[PDB]
Design a protein around this ligand. Structure first.
Ligand SMILES: Nc1ncnc2c1ncn2[C@@H]1O[C@H](COP(=O)(O)OP(=O)(O)O)[C@@H](O)[C@H]1O
Ligand SMILES: [Mg+2]
Lengths: 220, 308, 208, 215, 220
RNA sequence: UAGUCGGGUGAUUAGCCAGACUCUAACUUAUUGAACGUAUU
């Protein structure tokens, strides 16, 4: 359900974002980048062709399997066509856009990637020069990462026809922008957000003089 | 060969020594001693036969011991240890974790092999017997876990030997930066008159321990303590006062005075009297001037009567 | 024993308590007075004769810290730094230690909290274990109450043990003395960023 | 004020907040969260100290992460003082990002990370500056290592640039210096501290130049 | 609950007494005890068990004494593991057993066929009549089917797939390995079923039907 | 200021008096074994 375009509107105005949905979606994107559907289609096409030859050779027992594989192939083609039909950015490009946004806006984060560790997929980050898991990040870093990641995911999903999907339209409301941020970050946060999302209307609340020192009085 | 030497010393047959040694690592009595606050220490003492063998072994084989080692040394002790630091204003104390029980046959033989001073050479055939003489097997089921026990008469000697190279290196390093270093068993003491040099010592220690023993011997980081003339300073239960003299400490002195006063009025029971006498002998060793003062305060007659 | 008697008469709380437990009057009253005695200062504020506070904390291979020592003030200590400097890690470490006192005031041999084998060991530590060491002070009769929480990384064959018996020993004094004759008890609390929550009057706890 | 009403037929806690009677649910998040902290702590102290005249003078250790959470600067100036007066024997161990909070605390209470630590620092220390009673801008720069004016904003550098232009043209307003002056005036306003500083620079430099010519 | 837990798992824990509801409000000693003695033949005339709980803050803790129950349950568990034995039934039927029937019944994942599903929610108070219906339908399907026909069919499919791989179609090797695994699993299940000395599905069905008709007067 | 050191007084582990010290900074420990002191011999 996280790959469906209109999942971008799921719980958009609930107040928390859905950072859990981001992680699921991002791991999904990684798996698809490591294995494209067309080779799977080509492989499935080859398997269907091999199974068809076996059925033509008199082995009627594998007819049920052929029908199942033909169904799987048709579904894969349809998904590919729907993906093609949706004129959508490639999964590789989507991944790259979001990674760049996160790294640009979140000061402590220089890199983000998916590792296969032991059994299962894990998102890792280079935070203050050290590789850590998301659950190792400080609350300030995590909360801000969550905001940007969520917003970037939604923009990528809703703006497939733009060269830079983060240049899409919208209205974003943020309560207490300085939440958990040290003064040093408060001096950069508005500049970073406006640079990453240039056409969004931001309506924000603050208690911070440091934040206000970076904003024109007309906006206050 | 070790067997022949022991048999000669103990006036026993080679065969009976060898037979005894087969299960020697299990010939320990285990008991508890109360700690001074709450709780107990667990002690393992070798059986009498084994103690005799252990003593004979130590007599037959001289292992090197560094001069900085103050514990278990003939004609030295806690007074000498404390006195070594009494002139210095800044003090550092460090401690080793599970010191005796951390020393294994592997560590022992490594130390023999590494030793810079001259060590006795043992025949490979004797190595197994030596392990059985010196090391305790705490777990009946696990024949492979052999460790030194604090309760064994050989363990002091072996432990000091195992620290020989450590003491050599750290003593030399400290001397270059004008730091005084002594060791009393697992208790390490550093002192200096130069400010801000003792801060580097704990890091130096960790590296050296890792180098020599790997992960077998470690610092107890909870027990690393810095002190100075601003604060209380003691070394192995001896107070160093701000006049750079050894002292029993004010509280102990006041307690002794209390007991003498009780004795003066015939209020001390025999147990407390015996206790008082024993403690005064210790006081005489650490702080003879205190005894003089007590003689002055309480009448030489009273004190002489007490010490009769 | 005569040794405990001497220490107890010298003002040692643990010795006094040991004597009370073995002879089960005098010793009970010593323990209870140690905990309850205090005076009102010039400002009209009650002050216990025997204060209780965390003196010192040491962290070894814990999260970002390879080896870190902190000396705390008896009244107020404020920790400052940029995001990701380990300020929240420090309070987490302390809270887990305090959980051992709380568990043992509630129940004899109660279990406090543990360091995480998944997250709390420093990621690039060569030894694969962490230690959190604390010393508490409770008056001149109990100058040092040392605790250590330890944990080895997941997978590692050697397991590093915690040392919590001093916490249990002190908490036993509070619990036992209180059961005989009511005393005032210490408050331990952590307020982290999780305190910011939506309110619900409709949700009620039917649990105790 | 805080009190319980039952007359509507359900038990409701009400408070007088800024002169208005409201339910707890009506409080702002900042007010509620702080109320919750103090209420919880006071409850526990009352229950655990039955023999004290004032149970809030009991013993204990309280840990507070981000004490300034959701607080306006006005409240940040009161919060530590109020807590310490209400709970005088608790050991408080707190974390903060607020210079305003630090302005109310003695330097001896503060423990500060070294600026480029990387987690091998062995002992934490107090700052060199006395924070208690000090100006917030000084605490920003001397303790928190942050510029009092945002370096990433061009307008923050105009006065510096203006001064340099004045010194390049022997203290006289040239065409370039006049343009920048007008930009400063237009941006910061006629009554701004920045414009007053610029005016001051003009006056001083003109007078210095006159002295130089007399010499 | 302590017997059931320990028959299922070594070191299993049963249920404990509540500090809030199980202790008498005016108990002077401020603890509660539930003491039981079981009998198991002349060889084990007395199997005592005590469940205990003390109030918060008491000077001494009251712990349960469960070792004899665990020891006996361990004998059942260990002996059964080596060679199948008959095991004891424990069940509670409260007034909760009166509840309406969900007509819609869940798809058989195959937990209901496992022997120790017999201990699932056995002391919960309502039974699991839904589990009965699932299990009973399962039994019916197996009775109408042949068992090992799937193995024979799978054996035939693996043989057909092996011929295809021997004929030079290396692309179907992955599918062959999957099918061989399925065959091995089916044989193992069959063997485990054979090893577990379980009654045939037909016989199981018959026994239950007879029981129901005998005990419930209106049902023939 | 505080903490620490401790010469004296004090039916004395308290209290009181005098003098002093201040690297960010002691928390007094363990036997029957070993060593040291005293006693016994
Ligand atoms: N196990 C770990 N190993 C290494 N670094 C870690 C580990 N756990 C957390 N970190 C790092 O420690 C920091 C956590 O900061 P935190 O304790 O929340 O501090 P603060 O509250 O000051 O932001 C981050 O820099 C994070 O990457
Ligand atoms: Mg002795």
């Amino acid at each position: 359900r996280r790959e469906e375009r209109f999942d971008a509107y799921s719980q958009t105005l609930g107040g928390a974002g859905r950072f859990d949905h981001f992680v699921e979606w991002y791991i999904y994107l990684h798996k698809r980048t490591v294995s494209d559907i067309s080779s799977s289609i080509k492989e499935l096409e080859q398997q269907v062709n091999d199974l068809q030859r076996t059925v033509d050779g008199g082995m009627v027992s594998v007819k049920s399997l052929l029908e199942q594989m033909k169904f799987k192939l048709s579904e894969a083609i349809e998904r590919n066509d729907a993906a093609v039909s949706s004129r959508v950015l490639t999964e590789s490009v989507q991944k790259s856009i979001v990674e760049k946004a996160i790294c640009s806006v979140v000061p402590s984060i220089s890199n983000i990637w998916v590792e296969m560790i032991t059994g299962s997929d894990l998102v890792k980050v280079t935070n203050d020069g050290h590789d850590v898991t998301i659950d190792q990040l400080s609350d300030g870093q995590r909360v801000f990462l969550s905001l940007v990641a969520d917003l970037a995911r939604r923009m990528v999903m809703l703006n497939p026809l733009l060269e830079n999907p983060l240049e899409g339209r919208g209205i974003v409301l943020i309560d207490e922008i300085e939440l958990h941020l040290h003064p040093k970050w408060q001096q950069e946060v508005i500049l970073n957000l406006r640079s990453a999302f240039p056409n969004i209307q931001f309506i924000i609340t603050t208690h911070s003089p440091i934040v206000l020192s970076t904003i024109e009085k007309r906006c206050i | 060969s070790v067997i022949r030497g022991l048999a000669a010393v103990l006036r026993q047959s080679d065969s009976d020594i060898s037979a005894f040694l087969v299960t020697a690592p299990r010939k320990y009595k285990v008991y508890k001693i109360p700690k001074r606050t709450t709780g107990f220490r667990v002690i393992a003492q070798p059986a009498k036969g084994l103690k005799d063998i252990q003593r004979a072994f130590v007599q037959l084989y001289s292992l090197p011991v560094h001069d900085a080692s103050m514990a278990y040394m003939k004609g030295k002790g806690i007074r000498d240890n404390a006195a070594a630091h009494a002139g210095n204003q800044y003090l550092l104390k460090a401690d080793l974790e599970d010191f005796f029980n951390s020393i294994t046959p592997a560590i022992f033989w490594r130390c023999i092999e590494m030793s810079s001073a001259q060590t006795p050479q043992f025949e490979p055939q004797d190595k197994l017997f030596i392990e059985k003489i010196l090391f305790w097997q705490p777990i009946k089921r696990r024949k492979t876990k052999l460790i030194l026990s604090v309760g064994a008469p050989s363990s002091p000697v072996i432990s000091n030997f195992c620290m020989y190279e450590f003491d050599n290196r750290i003593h030399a390093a400290c001397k270059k930066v004008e730091i005084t270093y002594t060791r009393y068993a697992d208790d390490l003491t550093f002192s200096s008159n130069i400010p801000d040099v003792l801060k580097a010592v704990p890091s130096t220690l960790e590296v050296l321990l890792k180098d020599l023993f790997g992960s077998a011997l470690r610092l107890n980081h909870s027990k690393t303590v810095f002190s100075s003339k601003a604060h209380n300073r003691h070394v192995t239960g001896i107070t160093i006062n701000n006049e750079e003299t050894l002292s029993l400490g004010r509280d102990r002195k006041r307690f002794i005075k209390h007991l003498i006063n009780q004795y003066k009025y015939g209020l001390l029971d025999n147990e407390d009297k015996a206790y008082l006498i024993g403690l005064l002998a210790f006081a005489s060793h650490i702080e003879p001037s205190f005894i003089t003062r007590m003689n002055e305060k309480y009448s030489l007659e009273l004190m002489e009567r007490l010490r009769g | 024993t005569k040794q405990y008697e001497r220490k107890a008469k010298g003002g040692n709380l643990l010795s006094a308590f040991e004597l009370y437990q073995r002879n089960s009057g005098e010793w009970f009253e010593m323990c209870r007075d140690y905990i309850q005695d205090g005076h009102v200062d010039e400002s009209g504020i009650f002050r216990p004769d025997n204060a209780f506070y965390l003196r010192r904390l040491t962290l070894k291979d814990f999260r970002r810290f390879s080896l870190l020592e902190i000396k705390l003030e008896e009244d107020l200590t404020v920790i400052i730094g940029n995001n990701g400097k380990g300020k929240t890690s420090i309070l987490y470490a302390i809270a887990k230690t305090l959980s051992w006192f709380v568990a043992n005031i509630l129940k004899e041999g109660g279990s406090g909290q543990r360091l995480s084998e998944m997250t709390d060991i420093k990621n690039d530590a060569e030894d694969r274990y962490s230690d959190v060491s604390s010393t508490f002070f409770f008056g001149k009769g109990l100058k040092s109450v040392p605790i250590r929480l330890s944990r080895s990384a997941l997978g590692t064959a050697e397991r590093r043990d915690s040392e919590v018996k001093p916490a249990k020993d002190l908490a036993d004094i509070w619990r036992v003395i209180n059961e005989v004759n009511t005393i005032n008890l210490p408050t331990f609390a952590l307020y982290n960023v999780e305190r910011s929550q939506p309110f619900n009057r409709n949700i009620k706890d039917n649990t105790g | 004020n805080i009190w319980v009403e039952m007359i509507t037929g359900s038990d409701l806690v009400k408070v007088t907040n800024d002169g208005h009677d409201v339910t707890i649910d009506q409080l702002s998040d900042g007010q509620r969260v702080f109320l919750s902290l103090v209420a919880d702590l006071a409850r526990r102290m009352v229950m655990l100290n039955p023999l004290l005249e004032n149970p809030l003078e009991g013993r204990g250790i309280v840990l507070i992460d981000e004490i300034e959470l959701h607080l306006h600067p006005k409240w940040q100036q009161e919060v530590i003082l109020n807590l310490r007066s209400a709970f005088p024997n608790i050991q408080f161990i707190i974390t903060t990002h607020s210079p305003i909070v630090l302005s109310t605390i003695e330097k001896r209470c503060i423990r500060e990370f070294e600026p480029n630590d990387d987690g091998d620092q062995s002992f934490l220390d107090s700052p060199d500056m006395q924070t208690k009673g000090s100006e917030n801008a000084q605490i920003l720069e001397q303790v928190m290592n942050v510029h009092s004016t945002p370096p990433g904003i061009a307008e923050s550098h105009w006065l510096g640039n203006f001064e340099l232009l004045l010194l390049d043209n022997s203290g006289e307003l040239d065409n370039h210096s006049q343009v920048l002056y007008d930009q400063i005036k237009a941006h910061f306003g006629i009554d701004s501290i920045e414009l007053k500083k610029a005016d001051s620079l003009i006056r001083i430099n003109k007078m210095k130049n006159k002295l130089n010519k007399i010499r | 609950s302590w017997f059931v837990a320990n028959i299922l798992k070594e070191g299993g824990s049963g249920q404990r007494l509540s500090e809030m509801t199980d202790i008498k409000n005016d108990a002077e000693d401020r603890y509660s005890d539930v003491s039981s003695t079981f009998f198991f033949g002349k060889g084990l005339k007395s199997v005592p068990i005590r469940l205990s709980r003390s109030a918060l803050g008491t000077a001494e803790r009251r712990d349960s004494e469960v070792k004899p129950a665990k020891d006996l349950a361990d004998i059942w568990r260990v002996i059964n593991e080596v060679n199948t034995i008959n095991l004891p039934t424990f069940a509670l039927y409260n007034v909760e057993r009166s509840q309406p029937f969900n007509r819609n019944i869940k798809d058989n994942t195959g937990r209901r066929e496992e022997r120790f599903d017999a201990y699932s929610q056995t002391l919960g108070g309502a039974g699991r009549f839904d589990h009965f219906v699932e299990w009973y339908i399962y039994l019916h399907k197996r009775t109408v089917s042949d068992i090992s026909s799937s193995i024979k069919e799978l054996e035939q499919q693996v043989n057909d797939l092996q011929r295809t791989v021997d004929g030079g179609m290396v692309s179907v090797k992955s599918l062959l390995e999957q099918m061989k695994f399925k065959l091995s699993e089916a044989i193992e299940r069959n063997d485990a079923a054979v090893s577990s000395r379980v009654l045939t599905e037909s016989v199981q069905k018959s026994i239950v039907e007879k029981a129901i008709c005998s005990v419930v007067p209106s049902i023939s």
